[PDB]
Design a protein around this ligand. Structure first.
Ligand SMILES: Nc1ncnc2c1ncn2[C@@H]1O[C@H](COP(=O)(O)OP(=O)(O)OP(O)(O)=S)[C@@H](O)[C@H]1O
Ligand SMILES: Nc1ncnc2c1ncn2[C@@H]1O[C@H](COP(=O)(O)OP(=O)(O)OP(O)(O)=S)[C@@H](O)[C@H]1O
Ligand SMILES: Nc1ncnc2c1ncn2[C@@H]1O[C@H](COP(=O)(O)OP(=O)(O)OP(O)(O)=S)[C@@H](O)[C@H]1O
Ligand SMILES: Nc1ncnc2c1ncn2[C@@H]1O[C@H](COP(=O)(O)OP(=O)(O)O)[C@@H](O)[C@H]1O
Ligand SMILES: [Mg+2]
Ligand SMILES: [Mg+2]
Ligand SMILES: [Mg+2]
Lengths: 335, 319, 254, 340, 327, 258
């Protein structure tokens, strides 16, 4: 399992040695530490490295944490309920658990909270609205001797420039397939899995695209289908939504009409209704449509242009299906 | 200075239904109603400054005679007209006992009926239905769609239209004869052109020109009053070459102090109401005027944005 | 400088209760013969004017007049610390940025001291009081309050009409009409309940009930209220103090 | 008292440790601080509107000005600082700001007038005015127009377009310039000498070159490089490569590989290389900036190609500035520039 | 003392003779007030044209020095709702003056931020109480006012300040202050004003502060340009020439050195190049279409941030590709 | 089991009035030597701690301690039936799902009985009281309430400063500043009005006015209030009962901490 085998310190990290050394350098003197922003691909291990860095800044009790609840009152009598992950040395907030009320929670909670300082971990800073980021802009600078922010995100694209300047930027590159294979080897020798040939582990990496969280989960999922004994040709366990997207692309390249557009809209609705973001849906749909060998360069260029345009539309809109169906119709018109 | 004189819109405000130069059909209808009596519930809709409030005031006055003070209940948008007022005061007035001639009824005049809340409008239904034999309701609004359909079902509907050139010209000639003002044909033509079917605005501009220069001439009217903002915008949008439209926007609109928001919004109105060009090109021009707008509202409102909007409109018109 | 000590903080608290709500800014000025204060509401239909002579204080010292403006709300917020029986001293230098309110109990024990921020207001005291009014009348202020409280329920306008030996208050609105008629009379069994009236000319004025309601507060400062009416100027409602008075000038309707 | 402040500053990150306390510490924004120093002797401070790129020193400049004006005693009594972390609707602007403006100035002490000018007005500053709605901004118009005798308004923003035209007309516009290597090398060298930052010849000038007119980011990068060089303990000097490694800059060889894949290669190879490159975490904005620098600077492409590459990079940056997916935008940009 | 107010507030006109630029409306208003027929006024115009100063001086001339008591002045800073109208404005209009005898004046400054319900309630207050009070509505945008309210008032459009009046006010300020101004400096100052007296007064105070001297010297173009951070026509035309004729790399180097030597902004250079190219007599309007579209797109992108170098290269490429169609 | 009968329902009602508003959940525990109760607010800056000895009751029987948690609001909703003079008996079995409140008038006449639903709260009573505090003072609680009510209007923070023979409360905010200075004194004409002060070390702490306002409610339980302050721990405000006490421990503001 991902959680049973996870590093708890900086000396327990097993990939990106230069990043581990940079973290040790940054944690050598912990009091004169500026705000940090960990950015990189999703599933690389930045949330583990931030906790490992906190374990170097403070005692080992940083992992002994508790979940509490805090209530807030907006301009109306609608009560905002937010759970907080707290520790005797730091606290974690995730403003991605609500709508446009991120600014209120951010400002009030950070003002109440504001070695000698208490660390703050803002999870998924990409969901932070521009108004919440503007509110945090001055809170980052006014209280710099009591509150230090460690913002974990997957892409600095939606982060405003003032926030980017107000904190150090640390990139976490996805681990190489060799390091993923070495980690899976230790996992299967500790979990007592039977490998007929080691190369299958490499293939797992080649199916994860640098994601360790996905790699270990897929390894464990396929270890339950092969009954704790992986063979030389064990099938690759793909998530359900990926299969739905692949079938959607097959339907797209097979039939291009309005009658098929209706069932495409139905599939998009069924995907969106089951807690699947539309940006990831669009990304996977476009990337798997480019993989269609039936199309040519002229089709793929138009497809990527339309996907960029409708990604901008979706980032500027709120009704996600209104942009997804438009992108699908434009792709149908292109092919 | 110690005191002022009454404006010509208020001084020469018609007090008899014959002095109204509005829509002849509805005017004769209300005149015959006041002559015979039995005034029904009515809703008068139209545009500002065409003789709606004056019409109902004249009707009520002629119908009630001396009993106007104790038989007419006036409620404007300046007074509270909520559910509580309709429940208490309007009902007390409708239930009030009053000895009237056998052809008259108590009149409840409600100015700006399009601003009353939904609750008050809903409560007014049975209020006007149970006392429809001793109390009558006259609404005066600008948008009949703002009044609920149940209220419109219990009353007559009088839609007032714009005043043609002849009627406003006749009224202005009557006012000039009554005031002994020096005028000229081109000056009155410019006044009527800048009025746009608005009799109140026409009389106001006439009085302002008289008190500012004395002689009602087209030069004076144009130097004191502004050529219908929408007409210059229409001439700018209907330009055939880009340089002509750019020069018009620069000299007529930008060099005279017209804000970019007014220019773009007036621009939208002109286009929506345009009829010279087709529907698709009009929709494309509206789209360009609106994408720009989205930038005008964000604080990027400058001359370059309007120039780019005009360039995109011309490119759309460039086949 | 300002140095005025009230025997009982209560007197000042009741005086301020009179400005309360109906006005936001008050301009005080202390001088050799006492303290005056004026406040005008936003619509400019009501002027509240105060005068407290030197003798109303337990101690008063002034060698240099000081004018100071302040927010009424801020002042009342602070004006509930007087214990009523506490001693109150108003203090300020010749060029103040604040006004100090000092409440002390007889014994050295407890000392509550406040430093209220002042507002800059263009000094422009009005002197709108008339030599003679059309009619003048006084009656118990509790009676005047009841009269106002009665009629207020009926309308936003209360009319006061005066004819020889007759004072009549009238309100007429939606639910109906009401009137209170009073007649002049001398009660020797206690003349503080008498109703005097001197009429030089019949008067008939209308006032906004919301304002008369603000004015009745003065009952807490005096047993009687004097009402002076004229067709030429704002009406004057006056509440006498020991060495002083609180006056409300109210402009009639149209 | 003061020693606790000195120790807290010494245990503070270099961004807050070296915050300008006086108007002389401002290194590059001289045109504004000259007027601010001249009006310090007079008493006619007008309403001001600071605007410019982030990290140019607007907040630091106004803080130093308010300090030099009022002293550390009146610093907390004659200042109304409203940031973006507070509510700034119509209700707040009408009640709190107007009540503070209508109030009179607090009396200075005897020690204040002896060392500081102590002007007869107070200062209300509104930091990050971009988040203020236009109606709440128009509400400030007459508030700042009529009470100018007792209070002065200082607006601070990054985009001057977000503030309505009447407010921009009422205030004196002060544009803060970007802090490049030329006008900030002195400040960067001072910060390096005060912290004993042993670097090479072309490091500091390079740091600001990565900062692109941002002294805060440059100071943060310098602090990170100093920490990374002190952890090693080798006693050597910081190199430009070590600085650009932790600054998020793509190495030159990886960029040359992208140029080769764009010049020679089809859609499939470019897509595969982009998928491989997105595994290593790099900011798409930095990649676009480096590609722009390389393409515009290289004197080996046609002008017709240069117009198209400039427009494509502009469109890609404008799309990336809206929170879009970096992978899709980068792939689309590389594909569009490969068809050229 | 008035020596502590800023130059925008210190030099506020107190009489109608100190309001320059507006002559056709000022004379008409003076005639309205002298003859007695003063209708409901609607002063519509851009910011800094002198509408508030005009109406304040008018009320001063009408009521005297006691203007602050006989006039009801409401603005956006004060709460202006429908209930506020119903109570305050109606009680003011229905009653009479407490200080003298005469008509009343209600100055609804910045009335473009009022609610639609407030205007719908006020349009019948203006029409009912019209024998004892008047209404003055000041506006910058005429689209925020309902047509019913817009038709009840006489509209006066405050044109931007012309060259003669702004130079007269500059001369008045140079007389009131111990300051000298160069003719070309004065012309450059008038150029960067767009008819806004506020900007002129602010930058005049700022360049007087920039002088660093006891004011025995003059204020030249260099002082104005360095204080307002505005680009000079010389550097503007040099950048435009290097973009139009010189090489791509040379044009990039020229733009970089120009924008980095004086710390100029890219948006100011964009606006300056737009203003300069407006006089260029060009061929088929396609070049103008492309130029305007691309420049407006780049301006809208700059209004939100980004890479200054990328945007400068975009400006260069856009101008070049637009002019490549002229051959 | 729980079996506690109060002579006057009023005592219990005033005690609960003290927990009221400032806390939501209260954990009671009855035992051989009486009843204790603790409640902590959500921000954890205030602890309300009660102790009622066996002698405060008219009848008390306990052969087996019972711990029970409940919603304060629910309890007060029911706590206005005591007629004050009514007799109140708290009743619960050893493993309760509810708490029974039984109000009865002297005569058999009227019997109001309630069965309040309990909440499960992890038993974790705090024992944060100190051996010695920097300074200790007591004064009439009505006086303390006035002092708090005065200053509260000026700021959200009220500072308490203690020096030899001097206690000073201070508030400073937008409209200005205020202070109340009191001095120790023995009044023999009635010592319940005296102001005692024992200072081992000068103290200077700041508290959130909203919390001090919650605390002053204890005036209704005792004539005097004891205030114990330390720079090492939460301050203790105590209101003595006949056999018992109601205590409020309040954490000083760090700079911003209630
Ligand atoms: N038909 C008309 N004949 C003569 N004068 C007219 C006529 N219509 C309008 N007027 C003048 O315009 C003034 C105002 O007219 P109103 O009836 O109040 O305008 P309206 O048609 O009711 O539109 P509103 O009130 O803005 S919804 C009158 O006092 C007259 O002076
Ligand atoms: N001109 C300057 N001289 C010296 N240090 C500066 C200068 N500008 C910025 N800094 C440094 O950068 C830090 C941040 O300054 P700020 O004034 O907050 O920047 P900024 O212009 O406010 O950026 P924002 O808040 O995102 S708009 C200061 O504390 C200094 O350490
Ligand atoms: N015509 C003018 N003559 C002289 N000074 C002027 C003139 N117009 C503006 N000013 C100056 O600019 C200042 C501001 O004028 P205002 O009347 O407040 O501007 P405005 O026309 O009302 O536009 P607003 O207030 O932004 S809607 C005045 O105090 C004068 O110093
Ligand atoms: N140093 C490490 N060595 C081995 N496995 C690691 C290491 N750091 C993280 N992992 C594991 O790799 C996966 C990374 O995914 P995840 O933890 O979700 O990433 P993140 O920390 O960025 O949220 C998890 O299974 C995590 O436990
Ligand atoms: Mg009408
Ligand atoms: Mg800032
Ligand atoms: Mg104005």
């Amino acid at each position: 399992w991902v959680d049973k085998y996870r590093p708890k310190s900086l000396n327990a990290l097993s990939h990106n040695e230069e990043l581990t050394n940079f973290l040790k350098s940054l944690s050598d003197q912990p009091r004169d530490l500026p705000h940090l922003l960990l950015y990189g691909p999703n599933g690389t291990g930045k949330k583990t490295r931030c906790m490992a860095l906190l374990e170097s800044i403070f005692g080992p009790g940083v992992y002994r944490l508790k979940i509490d609840v805090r209530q807030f009152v907006t301009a109306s009598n609608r009560k905002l309920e937010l759970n907080v992950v707290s520790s005797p040395y730091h606290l974690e907030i995730t403003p991605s658990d609500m709508g446009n009320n991120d600014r209120i929670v951010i400002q009030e909670l950070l003002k109440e909270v504001a070695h000698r300082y208490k660390c703050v971990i803002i999870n998924e800073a990409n969901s932070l609205t521009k108004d919440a980021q503007a509110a945090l802009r001055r809170t980052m600078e006014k209280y710099s001797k009591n509150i230090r922010l460690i913002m974990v995100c997957d892409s600095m694209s939606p982060i405003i420039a003032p926030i980017k300047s107000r904190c150090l930027l640390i990139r976490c590159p996805a681990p190489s397939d060799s390091e993923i294979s070495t980690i899976l080897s230790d996992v299967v020798t500790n979990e007592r899995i039977q490998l007929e040939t080691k190369d299958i582990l490499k293939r797992i990496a080649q199916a994860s695209n640098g994601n360790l969280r996905v790699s270990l989960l897929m390894l464990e999922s396929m270890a339950l289908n092969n009954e704790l004994a992986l063979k030389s040709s064990s099938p690759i366990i793909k998530p359900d939504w990926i299969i739905v997207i692949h079938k959607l692309t097959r339907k797209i390249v097979k039939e291009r009409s309005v009658n098929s557009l209706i069932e495409c809209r139905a599939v998009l609705y069924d995907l969106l209704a089951h807690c699947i973001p539309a940006n990831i849906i669009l990304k996977e749909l476009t990337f798997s449509l480019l993989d269609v060998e039936t199309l040519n360069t002229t089709n793929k260029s138009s497809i990527i242009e339309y996907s960029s345009v409708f990604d901008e539309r979706l980032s500027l809109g709120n009704k996600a299906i209104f942009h997804l169906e438009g992108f699908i119709a434009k792709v149908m018109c292109c092919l | 200075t110690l005191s002022l004189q009454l404006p010509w819109v208020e001084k020469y405000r018609p007090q008899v239904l014959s002095d109204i130069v509005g829509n002849k059909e509805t005017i004769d209808r209300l005149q015959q109603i006041a002559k015979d009596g039995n005034m029904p519930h009515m809703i008068i809709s139209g545009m500002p400054g065409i003789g709606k409030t004056t019409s109902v005031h004249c009707l009520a006055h002629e119908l009630l005679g001396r009993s106007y003070a104790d038989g007419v209940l006036e409620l404007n948008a300046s007074d509270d007209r909520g559910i509580d007022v309709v429940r208490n005061q309007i009902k007390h007035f409708a239930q009030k006992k009053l000895h009237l001639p056998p052809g008259k009824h108590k009149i409840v005049i409600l100015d700006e009926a399009d601003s009353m809340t939904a609750g008050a409008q809903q409560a007014l239904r049975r209020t006007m239905e149970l006392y429809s034999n001793s109390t009558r309701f006259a609404f005066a609004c600008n948008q009949s769609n703002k009044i609920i359909e149940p209220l419109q079902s219990r009353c007559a509907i009088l839609r007032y239209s714009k005043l043609s050139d002849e009627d406003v010209l006749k009224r202005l000639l009557q006012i000039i004869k009554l005031e002994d003002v020096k005028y000229t044909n081109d000056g009155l033509e410019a006044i009527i052109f800048t009025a746009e079917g608005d009799m109140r605005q026409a009389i106001n501009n006439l009085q302002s020109t008289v008190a500012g220069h004395g002689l009602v001439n087209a030069d004076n009217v144009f130097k004191i009053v502004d050529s219908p903002h929408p007409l210059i915008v229409k001439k700018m949008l209907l330009a055939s070459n880009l340089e002509d439209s750019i020069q018009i926007l620069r000299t007529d609109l930008w060099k005279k102090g017209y804000s970019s928001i007014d220019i773009v919004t007036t621009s939208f109105r002109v286009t929506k109401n345009l009829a010279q060009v087709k529907e698709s090109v009009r929709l494309e021009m509206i789209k360009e005027i609106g994408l720009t707008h989205m930038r005008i509202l964000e604080g990027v409102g400058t001359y370059l944005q309007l120039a780019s909007m005009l360039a995109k409109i011309h490119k759309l018109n460039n086949k | 400088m300002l140095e005025a000590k009230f025997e009982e903080a209560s007197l000042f608290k009741r005086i301020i209760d009179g400005f309360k709500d109906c006005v936001q800014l008050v301009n005080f000025q202390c001088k050799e013969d006492g303290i005056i204060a004026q406040a005008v509401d936003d619509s400019r239909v009501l002027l509240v004017s105060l005068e407290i002579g030197v003798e109303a204080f337990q101690e008063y010292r002034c060698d240099h007049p000081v004018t100071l403006g302040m927010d009424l709300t801020s002042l009342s917020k602070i004006l509930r610390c007087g214990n009523n029986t506490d001693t109150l001293t108003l203090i300020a230098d010749n060029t103040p940025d604040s006004i100090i309110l000092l409440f002390e109990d007889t014994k050295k024990d407890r000392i509550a001291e406040y430093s209220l921020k002042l507002m800059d207001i263009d000094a422009d005291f009005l002197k709108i009081e008339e030599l003679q009014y059309d009619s003048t009348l006084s009656l118990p202020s509790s009676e005047f309050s009841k009269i106002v409280r009665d009629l207020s329920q009926l309308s936003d306008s209360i009319n006061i009409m005066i004819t020889k030996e007759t004072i009549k208050f009238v309100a007429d609105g939606d639910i109906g009409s009401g009137s209170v008629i009073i007649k002049p009379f001398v009660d020797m069994e206690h003349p503080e309940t008498s109703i005097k009236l001197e009429m030089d000319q019949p008067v008939d004025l209308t006032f906004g009930a919301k304002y008369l309601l603000d004015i009745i507060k003065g009952s807490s400062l005096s047993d009687r209220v004097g009402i002076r009416l004229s067709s030429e100027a704002p009406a004057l409602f006056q509440f006498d103090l020991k060495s002083g008075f609180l006056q409300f000038f109210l402009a009639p309707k149209f | 008292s003061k020693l606790a402040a000195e120790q807290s500053l010494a245990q503070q990150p270099w961004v807050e440790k070296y915050r300008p306390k006086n108007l002389d510490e401002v290194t590059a924004q001289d045109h504004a601080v000259t007027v601010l120093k001249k009006t310090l002797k007079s008493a006619n401070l007008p309403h001001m509107l600071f605007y410019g790129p982030p990290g140019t020193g607007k907040t630091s400049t106004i803080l130093a000005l308010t300090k030099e004006l009022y002293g550390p005693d009146l610093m907390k009594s004659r200042i109304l600082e409203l940031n973006a972390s507070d509510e700034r609707g119509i209700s707040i602007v009408r009640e709190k700001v107007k009540n503070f403006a209508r109030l009179t100035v607090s009396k200075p002490s005897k020690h204040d007038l002896e060392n500081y000018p102590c002007p007869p007005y107070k200062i209300i500053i509104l930091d990050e005015a971009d988040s203020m709605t236009a109606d709440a901004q128009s509400a400030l118009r007459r508030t700042m127009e009529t009470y100018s005798g007792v209070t002065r308004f200082c607006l601070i923003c990054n985009y001057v377009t977000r503030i309505i035209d009447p407010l921009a007309s009422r205030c004196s516009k002060f544009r803060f310039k970007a802090l490049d290597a030329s006008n900030a090398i002195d400040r960067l060298r001072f910060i390096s000498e005060q912290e004993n930052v042993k670097c090479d010849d072309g490091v500091l000038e390079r740091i600001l070159d990565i900062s692109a007119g941002d002294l805060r980011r440059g100071i943060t990068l310098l602090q990170s490089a100093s920490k990374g060089a002190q952890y090693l303990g080798d006693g050597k000097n910081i190199t430009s490569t070590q600085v650009e490694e932790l600054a998020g800059v793509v190495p030159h060889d990886i960029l040359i590989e992208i140029v080769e894949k764009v010049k020679s290669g089809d859609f499939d190879e470019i897509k595969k290389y982009v998928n491989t490159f997105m595994k290593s975490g790099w900011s798409a904005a930095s990649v676009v900036n480096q590609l722009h620098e390389y393409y515009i600077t290289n004197d080996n492409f046609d002008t017709n190609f240069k117009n198209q590459i400039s427009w494509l990079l502009f469109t890609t940056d404008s799309r990336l500035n809206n929170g879009t997916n970096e992978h899709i935008q980068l792939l689309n940009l590389l594909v569009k520039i490969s068809q050229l | 003392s008035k020596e502590n107010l800023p130059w925008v507030e210190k030099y506020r006109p107190e009489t109608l003779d100190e309001v320059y630029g507006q002559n056709e409306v000022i004379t008409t208003v003076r005639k309205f007030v002298d003859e007695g027929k003063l209708p409901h006024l609607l002063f519509y115009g851009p910011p800094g044209t002198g509408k508030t100063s005009t109406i304040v001086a008018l009320a001063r001339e009408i009521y005297g020095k006691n203007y602050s008591n006989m006039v009801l002045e409401l603005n956006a800073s004060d709460d202006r709702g429908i209930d506020v109208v119903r109570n305050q404005i109606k009680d003011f209009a229905s009653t009479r003056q407490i200080f003298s005898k005469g008509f009343k004046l209600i100055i609804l400054d910045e009335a473009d931020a009022m609610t639609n319900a407030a205007q719908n309630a006020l349009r019948r207050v203006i029409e009912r109480y019209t024998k004892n009070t008047r209404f003055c509505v000041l506006a910058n945008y005429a689209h925020k006012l309902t047509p019913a309210l817009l038709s009840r008032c006489t509209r006066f459009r405050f044109q931007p300040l012309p060259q003669e009046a702004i130079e007269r006010r500059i001369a008045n300020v140079l007389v009131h202050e111990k300051l000298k101004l160069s003719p070309n400096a004065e012309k450059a100052l008038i150029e960067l004003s767009n008819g806004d007296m506020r900007r002129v007064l602010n930058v005049l105070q700022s360049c007087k502060a920039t002088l660093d001297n006891p004011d025995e010297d003059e204020i030249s173009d260099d002082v104005i340009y360095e204080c307002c951070g505005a680009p000079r026509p010389s550097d503007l035309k040099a950048v435009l020439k290097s973009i139009l004729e010189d090489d791509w790399g040379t044009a990039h180097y020229t733009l970089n050195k120009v924008r980095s030597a004086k710390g100029l902004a890219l948006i100011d250079l964009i606006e300056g190049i737009v203003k300069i190219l407006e006089d260029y007599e060009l061929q088929n309007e396609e070049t103008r279409v492309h130029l305007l579209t691309k420049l407006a797109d780049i301006e809208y992108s700059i209004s939100k941030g980004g890479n200054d170098q990328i945007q400068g290269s975009a400006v260069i490429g856009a101008i070049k590709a637009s002019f490549e169609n002229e051959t």
